[PDB]
Design an enzyme around this catalytic site. Structure first.
Site, PDB file in Angstrom:
ATOM      1  N   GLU A   1      -3.170  -7.647  -1.806  1.00  0.00           N
ATOM      2  CA  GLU A   1      -4.540  -7.422  -1.376  1.00  0.00           C
ATOM      3  C   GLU A   1      -5.133  -6.273  -2.179  1.00  0.00           C
ATOM      4  OE1 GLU A   1      -5.762  -4.716   0.737  1.00  0.00           O
ATOM      5  OE2 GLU A   1      -7.783  -5.572   0.683  1.00  0.00           O
TER       6      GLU A   1
ATOM      7  N   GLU B   1      26.372   7.000 -12.449  1.00  0.00           N
ATOM      8  CA  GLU B   1      27.138   8.039 -11.770  1.00  0.00           C
ATOM      9  C   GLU B   1      26.808   8.071 -10.281  1.00  0.00           C
ATOM     10  OE1 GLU B   1      29.476  10.017 -13.020  1.00  0.00           O
ATOM     11  OE2 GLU B   1      29.326   9.113 -15.013  1.00  0.00           O
TER      12      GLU B   1
ATOM     13  N   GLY C   1       3.550  -6.683   5.510  1.00  0.00           N
ATOM     14  CA  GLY C   1       3.981  -7.995   5.057  1.00  0.00           C
ATOM     15  C   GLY C   1       4.210  -8.062   3.563  1.00  0.00           C
ATOM     16  N   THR C   2       3.347  -7.406   2.782  1.00  0.00           N
ATOM     17  CA  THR C   2       3.553  -7.342   1.339  1.00  0.00           C
ATOM     18  C   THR C   2       4.856  -6.630   1.010  1.00  0.00           C
ATOM     19  OG1 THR C   2       1.166  -7.348   0.921  1.00  0.00           O
ATOM     20  CG2 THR C   2       2.603  -6.557  -0.839  1.00  0.00           C
TER      21      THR C   2
ATOM     22  N   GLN D   1       0.826  -1.205   0.000  1.00  0.00           N
ATOM     23  CA  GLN D   1       0.000   0.000   0.000  1.00  0.00           C
ATOM     24  C   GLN D   1       0.861   1.255   0.000  1.00  0.00           C
ATOM     25  OE1 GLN D   1      -3.009   0.147   3.071  1.00  0.00           O
ATOM     26  NE2 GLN D   1      -3.967   1.896   2.044  1.00  0.00           N
TER      27      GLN D   1
ATOM     28  N   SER E   1       8.043  -0.447   1.449  1.00  0.00           N
ATOM     29  CA  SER E   1       8.208  -0.085   2.844  1.00  0.00           C
ATOM     30  C   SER E   1       8.953  -1.199   3.567  1.00  0.00           C
ATOM     31  CB  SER E   1       6.852   0.184   3.504  1.00  0.00           C
ATOM     32  OG  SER E   1       6.073  -0.997   3.540  1.00  0.00           O
TER      33      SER E   1
ATOM     34  N   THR F   1       3.574   2.387  13.776  1.00  0.00           N
ATOM     35  CA  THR F   1       2.146   2.144  13.613  1.00  0.00           C
ATOM     36  C   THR F   1       1.748   0.674  13.729  1.00  0.00           C
ATOM     37  OG1 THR F   1       0.224   2.677  12.244  1.00  0.00           O
ATOM     38  CG2 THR F   1       2.176   1.848  11.127  1.00  0.00           C
TER      39      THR F   1
ATOM     40  N   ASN G   1       3.922  11.291   0.349  1.00  0.00           N
ATOM     41  CA  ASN G   1       4.329  10.669  -0.899  1.00  0.00           C
ATOM     42  C   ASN G   1       4.527  11.688  -2.013  1.00  0.00           C
ATOM     43  OD1 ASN G   1       3.512   8.297   0.692  1.00  0.00           O
ATOM     44  ND2 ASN G   1       1.453   8.680  -0.127  1.00  0.00           N
TER      45      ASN G   1
HETATM   46  N1  LIG Z   1       3.630   7.459   1.678  1.00  0.00           N
HETATM   47  C1  LIG Z   1       2.866   6.477   2.165  1.00  0.00           C
HETATM   48  N2  LIG Z   1       3.302   5.624   3.169  1.00  0.00           N
HETATM   49  C2  LIG Z   1       2.487   4.639   3.635  1.00  0.00           C
HETATM   50  C3  LIG Z   1       1.219   4.475   3.103  1.00  0.00           C
HETATM   51  N3  LIG Z   1       0.609   3.443   3.716  1.00  0.00           N
HETATM   52  C4  LIG Z   1       1.459   2.934   4.625  1.00  0.00           C
HETATM   53  N4  LIG Z   1       2.619   3.658   4.593  1.00  0.00           N
HETATM   54  C5  LIG Z   1       3.772   3.370   5.452  1.00  0.00           C
HETATM   55  O1  LIG Z   1       3.987   1.976   5.391  1.00  0.00           O
HETATM   56  C6  LIG Z   1       4.009   1.375   6.666  1.00  0.00           C
HETATM   57  C7  LIG Z   1       3.154   0.117   6.623  1.00  0.00           C
HETATM   58  O2  LIG Z   1       2.458   0.089   5.399  1.00  0.00           O
HETATM   59  P1  LIG Z   1       2.723  -1.105   4.357  1.00  0.00           P
HETATM   60  O3  LIG Z   1       4.136  -1.611   4.480  1.00  0.00           O
HETATM   61  O4  LIG Z   1       2.444  -0.599   2.964  1.00  0.00           O
HETATM   62  O5  LIG Z   1       1.655  -2.247   4.729  1.00  0.00           O
HETATM   63  P2  LIG Z   1       1.117  -3.207   3.557  1.00  0.00           P
HETATM   64  O6  LIG Z   1       2.147  -3.361   2.465  1.00  0.00           O
HETATM   65  O7  LIG Z   1      -0.170  -2.642   3.014  1.00  0.00           O
HETATM   66  O8  LIG Z   1       0.842  -4.625   4.260  1.00  0.00           O
HETATM   67  P3  LIG Z   1      -0.660  -5.115   4.573  1.00  0.00           P
HETATM   68  O9  LIG Z   1      -1.320  -4.206   5.587  1.00  0.00           O
HETATM   69  O10 LIG Z   1      -0.592  -6.509   5.139  1.00  0.00           O
HETATM   70  O11 LIG Z   1      -1.475  -5.129   3.300  1.00  0.00           O
HETATM   71  C8  LIG Z   1       3.464   2.393   7.647  1.00  0.00           C
HETATM   72  O12 LIG Z   1       4.342   2.524   8.739  1.00  0.00           O
HETATM   73  C9  LIG Z   1       3.410   3.700   6.888  1.00  0.00           C
HETATM   74  O13 LIG Z   1       4.343   4.604   7.426  1.00  0.00           O
HETATM   75  C10 LIG Z   1       0.782   5.318   2.103  1.00  0.00           C
HETATM   76  O14 LIG Z   1      -0.343   5.173   1.647  1.00  0.00           O
HETATM   77  N5  LIG Z   1       1.604   6.315   1.642  1.00  0.00           N
END
Ligand SMILES: Nc1nc2c(ncn2[C@@H]2O[C@H](COP(=O)(O)OP(=O)(O)OP(=O)(O)O)[C@@H](O)[C@H]2O)c(=O)[nH]1
Ligand SMILES: Nc1nc2c(ncn2[C@@H]2O[C@H](COP(=O)(O)OP(=O)(O)OP(=O)(O)O)[C@@H](O)[C@H]2O)c(=O)[nH]1
Ligand SMILES: Nc1nc2c(ncn2[C@@H]2O[C@H](COP(=O)(O)OP(=O)(O)O)[C@@H](O)[C@H]2O)c(=O)[nH]1
Ligand SMILES: Nc1nc2c(ncn2[C@@H]2O[C@H](COP(=O)(O)OP(=O)(O)O)[C@@H](O)[C@H]2O)c(=O)[nH]1
Lengths: 39, 49, 47, 440, 50, 428, 432, 428
Positions: free
Chosen positions: D71, D254, D144-145, D11, D140, D179, D228
């Site tokens: 997902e 570079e 988990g993804t 996400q 990120s 979080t 973002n």
């Molecule tokens: N810039 C930005 N950062 C995000 C966003 N959503 C989540 N994050 C960051 O990502 C961390 C966890 O999100 P993800 O790693 O994307 O979680 P996920 O990949 O959706 O994993 P699942 O919840 O199991 O589907 C959080 O600590 C946020 O700081 C977003 O929509 N935009």
């Protein structure tokens, strides 16, 4: 953004072909562009 | 029903203005720039210098 | 008799679009008749 | 010719890539339905979209990107909203069951129903590119993804395209605020698996952007949209010389040749210049010296790690817009005469200058109109403390085996935590061994 | 010829388009500048042949 | 008739020689489109030194345009004098420099050097007698170092009795545009030494110092930096292009300035230079020319001649002038500055005078100096290389392209074995 | 003079035929009556000195129904009332019934009609046979037919487009038996058996054409578009053209290795098309991907023995030359060593026609006939099933009844063994 | 009066010679209808070489068009210069070659060569003095290689004292349009060794590369390759069609490029070739022609001549030009390239000049190269032939048509027995 570059643009060293009009700092990779891979 | 006919008039003249704007792109783009693109260069205006 | 003498003419014409369509490199490669394709969408949606 | 393929995982990655591609479409002029309205006649001109957008039959600029999430609904926002006609229907790839903040579900059980599809799309994208310069992997260190499927992508892309460059843009979990409760577990695991597979990994911490949005942007209640979007501005700056022309055309190779001194040390800090919110453009001159000093200030960093507790190794400055060579060398001389910025004694010339003549075109929103910007990528050993805080959290949780039953029962063996911790500690030991001064 | 044809062409548009934009006055300035070039060159050729 | 094959490698070399061709076509009266429209018959008398004649009275510059990034060729083709070069001479490869000497010397650089040599052989056997080669590049960075030195070696092996001038932009102390400048310069100077006949070291420090202290520019940029190098490029090759009294071409400068084969690193200078505010206060004469030539503000390398004895000096004047002033001023410099000149070369200053000045100027003069003071330029690179090499910094990709530690050690040893002769000849 | 009789045998046949002759009719503008509303049609259409163009084919089904729909359909006056031969009792999913019982009462009329349609041909190129491997007539009749045609039309090609039993789905229970007893009919009485499989086409239509619910119509149209490219050089003009004999020469390596696999490239759906360039490179690459093959079989589990890229549309040699080079540099595609040059190329000019259906209007298109060894997989799955039953002697009673000795069943398996062994040892790298 | 009967076999040979007839008819001034509409008497002076007189001043080409498929005849008759040939010369069959040399040589090809021999006998007997025959064919495939070599053989024992020139399209390693092409090529080269007098090996890859790096055409088509073949054909037959100083027909080209009776396979080249955007940069003269000829990029065979020694080299110029300017260049190439020319043949370059140039140009020159490097084609075809033959791949289609094993073995062995002398003369 009006810059020194955009004033002196058709005389600057590192500026490609100005085929369009808004920014002279576009990219015009048409001369390099190897002949088998070219349109 | 009055609201529906009001939106309907808005759509009417919106398509009017869109066709107007598209023909303005046609006259600016297809005619004038293509006829402009055969402009002679600096040396030819200097007189074959 | 004019048939074979028109078969040559037929080919000549069918070989006057190649020296145009093919010539344009941006058509020989990426080529899509937006018109016909657009119709297929509208038709598939009606279907 | 200079193409780079972006793939967004999770996400976080998908919304970062959404904010990235909005900026890319406003920078190159492609409308949301994938049409350039400025080349209908006097076309056959511009090629600057060729690193981001391809070209198809009906004048359409399909993005060179793959959005993947295990997902749905985060991709369904893309397929429903204003960019449904931009991306290809098959590049956006979804599963049907969530990875659910689990590295084991992201890497071992639900990654295998989609890894072949993602690799097929990446293969076709790389096939329709003449010279591929790099992959840009937006993910990120949290979910988990974005941990497990990212690591699987690193493994398979290292198998298939081992010569090619893989830049990472990744969201680090917060040292303080965070979080989730399994963020240290997933972070340490994917740090271990992506250390040997990322050529250059840029790290972005959330409350650092929160602080610079509170201070520089005057936004007391910021949003992931703003976060973002700022990440998008940083990546638009890093991919700018393979878009436009400048005095110092500086490439991804570079960047790899100046940031990393050794193969393991490939984690730079990114900073941007003007985070101004247009109530602050009436009072800052925003000269080259000011935008250079704001980069080295220890308050505009995007990772919560103070560079005073560390030594700079090498930094690339990426200047954009009305920048003069005399101004950039005066700013670099001032930075070197400043004492608070320490450089390693085994790197006298620790700067690489890149100058681009194309100033940033703004999204309607937060950031102001500026004739100048600079993205400053510094390889510093001050990231070791940011590593150490999640190591403290990971040890504090793994001391008596909390949340381990999910990871073990899903399919991942127990020794992964121990080897991730050991490789992480070895990486930190390498940071101190490299950062200490020369005495022989 | 290009300036005259462009000016005569852009003189007609639809009713909610035809304005004195940032195109009409540049075309008029180009036409005037072309004209001044024309008589200055006529005079210079006259002095040359004299 | 004699002619020079021009070569330019890297973004730096390409832009500098682009400005050079701009300058020299301004001198010879060649328009952007390639034809001739000038005023004197003394311009086409020796136009076959740099311009090959084409059909229809067109003059195509003889230059081989080499780079590994496929954007600098595009910029050169789209520049001011872009529609003047041969399109076949635009030799390139869709790859990256990566500011890497290994990637310029043992890779796709060596895969492009064959096509480059084919073009060079065309322009060198389309001749009757070739004086030599003129390569422009930058040592700090890729292409100009890697492709440049590889081209240097192969061209020197193929043509072993022709003069060869390399204008090298050498890395600058206070600011560095790339990190691996000491690595590239150390690996490139070793090839520069035992191959070339005249090496001109141009430093960005001295270019910016001429821009600031002498010329008083507001925003100096790379166009003016390369303009200052095109100054000395035009000044050196003037006696074989325009008539004069006491002519001196490339070999007659090399004989009088290279006392030993290892010592050919020079410090160029061009000195009818003044700011636009000081322009109306000038008293343009030969003594003023010598005054601006022999100060350490116009010399185009970051090396102070106050720190080393002058081995040889050459002064190539360009204008209608009395030879009495020139001879007496070049004697007066040597007599008033005694400790700055070596004693074992009596009268170590050479004089040449061409009649036709650069266009729009009454009188010019270019300076070339082989001095002891070329010490510091190689020394600072040596300590920076030692500092970055003791801790193995920025080297894994150097060995990934196929090098060894011993080549680096040999490059440092040959830098020091260049420094020691110019140590010892600076101390009798 | 490049004629081509099209013997469609069985429900499958009559239906794959319907689509085929519809594409044929539109391709060479011929109304469903047979009246053009120059000679690019003799390959499939004969002129009855009046403007009426009758099809050169023989629809044959041992049961009515299937064909009766065509006799009371829109294409009713086009076909000759006799070309469409129909029986009066189904073959009841039984090779025996269709080869030794109900078929021995229709084969004679079929062979007569074939000679009647093989006399009006100045130069019959080859026969195109469209049958199923898991039906009574499809297997039994095609067996009888192809055998009798061998003793007669011997020096004429006998291509065979078939629907090999599925590798999971399947619609019959006696399918394996019929498909294994029809092996000694497509191995020693055919000249190039192009075997297709519904399961795969379903996926090719559910992932590339977006038709989430494919029927049999959205499947035959594809088999028809493929047969058109293998019969276009013998119809519309073009550049590097390639006829039937040529395809074979440059595809069948040894006598008993004629089982090519087909793969059309532009299988997009006017909507995903806009987001794709659809160029010769892409079209070439597609054909060389597992998820596009027309027989659930991964071409990565085997070595390509040869390949016939038959392009069609606005393609220039330059493009094929390039696309082939990229495929000759992909670690995946692994070719046998005994075939250095392994690409027979064919470039026609007439672009693909569009029958109001699914596939979009594509300016360029390509059909590939490769002789991969990854066909042993399919030939193996079926044998597993046939063996899983010929051990418990299930359904074998019906066959004995309709005239057939166990021997037949047993022998059949042994033959497919040789075939499998062959198409599994002609790839393994050489030892000396 | 001398004359050449033109045979064209196969699809490839048919369009190649169709372009040849177009270029030579528009050189000589004959319209598509067949009448003379020209401007000089020299066009009609030597028209009795390729054109037989008919009634009403309607010249008909002396060509026999041979194919086993009646579609290429329809294409040629629909061509621009299609209504010029005699229809009885359109010999064809309602059959198929199948890209099979056995089916072209041991079958209906031999059943149709009786009619082909009847027409070539009447066209070679309505004469008074025959020079020879010029056959165009593809070496890989059927008809042109299948029936083509058989036609070569039978016309050879019917006319043993007339010259035979086979323009053959040799196969390619990187990209091949057919699969059994090494079989066809090996079998056809077996007869081409000891039947014909001139062989011209014209690969498609070299033509494609000339279309890319020299002509810079983004659309290289079959017609663009066949025109490059046709210009070479005109360059080798021009001296008996037009006057000039130092004329040279086919026979005194042959006596100079054939030192031994098996070394007659050439690599041709036509070289006033230049791009549209780089034409106006050129300086088209004898030195530019010489460089363009002798470069290893305008060869029409895919063999680098830097890998072997030039046995003999012919240069047939067309245009008004000096004689010293030709002789000194033909000298300079030999003197400067000393290791690329054989020592035991002193001055192994033959010079021929014709006055009349091709249209739209002023100076042209065709190149005939008997190089050691032609062994690459034969070794490469032999490698692919051995790879397919050690496993009997695609051999049942030949044994069925009537061949057997030792003919394939003897063809392979004769290819090695041709590779051996072109190895021995390459190292003396
Ligand atoms: N810039 C930005 N950062 C995000 C966003 N959503 C989540 N994050 C960051 O990502 C961390 C966890 O999100 P993800 O790693 O994307 O979680 P996920 O990949 O959706 O994993 P699942 O919840 O199991 O589907 C959080 O600590 C946020 O700081 C977003 O929509 N935009
Ligand atoms: N495209 C398409 N394929 C069909 C159609 N009908 C049948 N098939 C294919 O044919 C297979 C079954 O055909 P068969 O079992 O041989 O039917 P048959 O040839 O009439 O033999 P009998 O059952 O004895 O009457 C199915 O699995 C399908 O794959 C159809 O209407 N359209
Ligand atoms: N004089 C001059 N120097 C330049 C110019 N452009 C770049 N340089 C110098 O070139 C150096 C780096 O060039 P380099 O990386 O080697 O370019 P490359 O050879 O293409 O890789 C910088 O330190 C600049 O000072 C120019 O236009 N003029
Ligand atoms: N130069 C040239 N080559 C051609 C032409 N047509 C075909 N070829 C070449 O001929 C080869 C195949 O021809 P081939 O199969 O032998 O035709 P066939 O003799 O009728 O069987 C291809 O690889 C093409 O490269 C042409 O018009 N000009």
């Amino acid at each position: 953004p009006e810059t020194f570059w955009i004033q002196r643009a058709p005389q600057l060293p590192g500026v490609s072909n100005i085929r369009t009009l808004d920014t002279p700092f576009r990219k015009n990779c048409s001369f390099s562009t190897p002949v088998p891979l070219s349109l | 029903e009055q609201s529906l006919r009001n939106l309907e008039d808005t759509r009417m003249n919106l398509e009017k203005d869109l066709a107007v704007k598209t023909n303005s792109l046609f006259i600016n783009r297809q005619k004038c720039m293509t006829h402009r693109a055969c402009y002679p260069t600096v040396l030819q205006l200097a007189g074959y210098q | 008799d004019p048939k074979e003498a028109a078969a040559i003419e037929a080919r000549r014409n069918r070989e006057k679009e190649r020296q145009s369509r093919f010539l344009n490199v941006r058509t020989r490669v990426m080529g899509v008749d937006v018109e016909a394709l657009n119709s297929q969408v509208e038709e598939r949606k009606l279907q | 010719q200079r193409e780079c393929i972006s793939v967004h995982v999770g996400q976080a990655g998908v919304q970062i890539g959404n904010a990235c591609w909005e900026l890319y479409c406003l920078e190159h002029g492609i409308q949301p339905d994938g049409q350039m309205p400025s080349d209908k006649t006097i076309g056959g001109g511009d090629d600057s979209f060729n690193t981001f957008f391809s070209e198809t039959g009906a004048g359409k600029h399909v993005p060179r990107a793959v959005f993947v999430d295990l997902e749905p609904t985060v991709i369904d926002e893309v397929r429903t909203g204003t960019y449904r006609q931009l991306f290809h229907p098959e590049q956006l790839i979804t599963g049907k069951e969530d990875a659910a903040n689990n590295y084991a579900r992201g890497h071992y059980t639900i990654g295998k129903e989609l890894i072949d599809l993602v690799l097929d799309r990446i293969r076709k994208l790389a096939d329709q590119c003449t010279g591929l310069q790099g992959f840009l992997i937006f993910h990120s260190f949290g979910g988990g993804t974005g941990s497990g499927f990212t690591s699987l992508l690193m493994e398979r892309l290292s198998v298939d395209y081992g010569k090619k460059s893989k830049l990472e843009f990744s969201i680090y979990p917060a040292p303080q605020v965070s979080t989730a409760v399994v963020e240290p577990y997933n972070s340490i695991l994917t740090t271990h698996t992506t250390l040997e597979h990322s050529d250059c990994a840029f790290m972005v911490d959330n409350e650092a952007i929160y602080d610079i949005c509170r201070r520089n942007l005057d936004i007391e209640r910021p949003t992931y949209t703003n976060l973002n979007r700022l990440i998008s501005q940083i990546v638009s700056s890093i991919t700018a010389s393979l878009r436009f022309d400048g005095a110092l055309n500086v490439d991804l190779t570079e960047f790899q040749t100046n940031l990393v001194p050794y193969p393991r040390i490939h984690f730079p800090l990114a900073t941007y210049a003007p985070v101004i919110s247009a109530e602050k453009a009436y009072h800052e001159q925003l000269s080259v010296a000011e935008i250079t000093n704001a980069c080295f200030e220890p308050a505009n960093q995007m990772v919560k790690c103070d560079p005073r507790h560390g030594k700079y190794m090498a930094c690339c400055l990426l200047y954009r817009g009305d920048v003069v060579p005399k101004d950039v060398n005066a700013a670099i001389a001032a930075i070197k005469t400043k004492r608070s910025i320490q450089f390693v004694d085994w790197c006298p010339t620790g700067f690489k200058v890149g100058i681009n003549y194309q100033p940033p075109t703004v999204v309607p929103g937060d950031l102001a109109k500026v004739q100048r910007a600079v993205c400053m990528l510094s390889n510093t050993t001050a990231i070791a403390e940011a590593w150490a805080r999640l190591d403290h959290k990971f040890d504090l949780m793994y001391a008596k085996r909390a949340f381990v039953h999910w990871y073990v029962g899903e399919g991942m063996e127990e020794g992964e935590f121990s080897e991730a911790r050991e490789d992480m500690a070895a990486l930190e030991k390498d940071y101190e061994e490299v950062g200490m001064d020369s005495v022989e | 010829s290009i300036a005259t044809d462009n000016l005569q062409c852009q003189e007609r548009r639809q009713h909610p388009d035809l304005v004195r934009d940032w195109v009409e006055m540049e075309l008029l300035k180009e036409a005037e500048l072309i004209r001044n070039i024309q008589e200055l060159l006529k005079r210079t050729i006259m002095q040359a042949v004299n | 008739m004699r002619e020079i094959v021009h070569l330019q490698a890297g973004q730096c070399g390409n832009q500098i020689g682009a400005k050079f061709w701009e300058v020299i076509s301004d001198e010879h009266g060649i328009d952007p489109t390639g034809t001739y429209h000038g005023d004197s018959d003394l311009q086409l008398e020796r136009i076959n030194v740099y311009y090959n004649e084409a059909t229809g009275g067109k003059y195509v510059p003889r230059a081989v345009l080499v780079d590994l990034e496929p954007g600098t060729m595009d910029s050169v083709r789209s520049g001011p004098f872009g529609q003047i070069f041969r399109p076949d001479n635009f030799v390139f490869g869709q790859s990256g420099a990566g500011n890497n000497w290994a990637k310029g010397h043992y890779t796709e650089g060596a895969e492009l050097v064959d096509s480059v040599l084919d073009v060079v052989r065309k322009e060198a056997e389309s001749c009757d007698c070739l004086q030599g080669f003129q390569l422009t590049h930058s040592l700090g960075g890729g292409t100009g170092s890697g492709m440049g030195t590889l081209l240097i070696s192969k061209i020197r092996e193929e043509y072993p009795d022709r003069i060869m001038n390399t204008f090298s932009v050498v890395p600058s102390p206070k600011v560095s545009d790339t990190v691996v400048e000491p690595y590239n310069a150390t690996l490139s100077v070793h090839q520069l030494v035992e191959n070339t006949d005249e090496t001109y070291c141009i430093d960005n420090e001295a270019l910016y110092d001429i821009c600031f202290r002498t010329l008083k520019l507001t925003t100096p940029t790379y166009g003016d930096l390369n303009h200052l190098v095109s100054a000395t490029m035009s000044g050196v090759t003037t006696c074989l292009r325009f008539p004069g009294q006491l002519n001196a071409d490339l070999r007659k400068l090399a004989v009088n300035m290279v006392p030993f084969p290892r010592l050919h690193f020079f410090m160029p200078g061009f000195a009818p230079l003044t700011s636009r505010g000081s322009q109306q206060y000038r008293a343009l004469t030969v003594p003023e020319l010598t005054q601006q030539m022999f100060d350490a503000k116009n010399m185009m390398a970051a090396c102070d001649p106050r720190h080393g004895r002058y081995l040889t000096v050459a002064a190539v004047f360009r204008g209608r002038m009395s030879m009495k002033e020139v001879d007496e001023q070049m004697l007066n410099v040597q007599n008033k500055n005694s400790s700055y000149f070596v004693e074992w070369i009596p009268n170590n200053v050479k004089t040449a005078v061409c009649d036709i000045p650069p266009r729009g100027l009454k009188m010019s003069a270019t300076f070339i100096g082989n001095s002891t003071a070329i010490q510091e330029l190689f020394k600072r690179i040596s300590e920076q290389f030692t500092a970055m090499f003791r801790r193995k910094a920025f080297l894994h990709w150097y060995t990934g392209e196929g090098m060894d530690e011993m080549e680096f050690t040999e490059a440092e040893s040959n830098m020091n074995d260049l420094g020691n002769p110019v140590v010892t000849r600076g101390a009798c």
